[PDB]
Amino acid sequence: YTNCKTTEDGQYIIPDEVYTIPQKESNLEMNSEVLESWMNYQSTTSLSIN
Amino acid sequence: TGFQICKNALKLPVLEVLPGGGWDNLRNVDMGRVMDLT
């Protein structure tokens, strides 16, 4: 770290045997969904006789 | 070749992208200094 370097956008101190070339970003979100619902019903009889 | 002297004198940040640097056209990625930058 003799002639102690620093990255161009100075926010680090690289050692003087390395050089940097700055770039990036990347991300990706994704999601899914699934629902359901069911029902039913009834029946009836009746007879009143005589 | 230490820009820190005048980056210290005047408080501006050094540009990051610089042309004087070799470049592999096959792998397609920067390689190293060629033209010196004082």
DSSP of B10-33: S-PPPPS--SSEEEETTTTEEEEE
Cβ-count burial B1-30 (b if 16+ within 10 Å, e if not): eeeeeeeeeeeeeeeeeeeeeeeeeeeeee
Q: What six digits make up the tokens of B10?
A: 């005047």
Q: What six digits make up the tokens of A41?
A: 């019903």
Nearest to B15 by CA among A8, A24, A23, A6: A8
**Which among B2, B16, B21 has CB closest to A9?**
B16
Whether the Cβ atoms of residue B8 and residue B14 lie closer than 8 Å to each other: no
Residues of chain A neighbouring B15 (CB-CB closer than 8 A): 8
**Which among B13, B18, B32 has CB closest to A10?**
B13
Q: Do B14 and A8 touch (CB under 8 A)?
A: yes
Q: What six digits make up the tokens of B3?
A: 């820009």
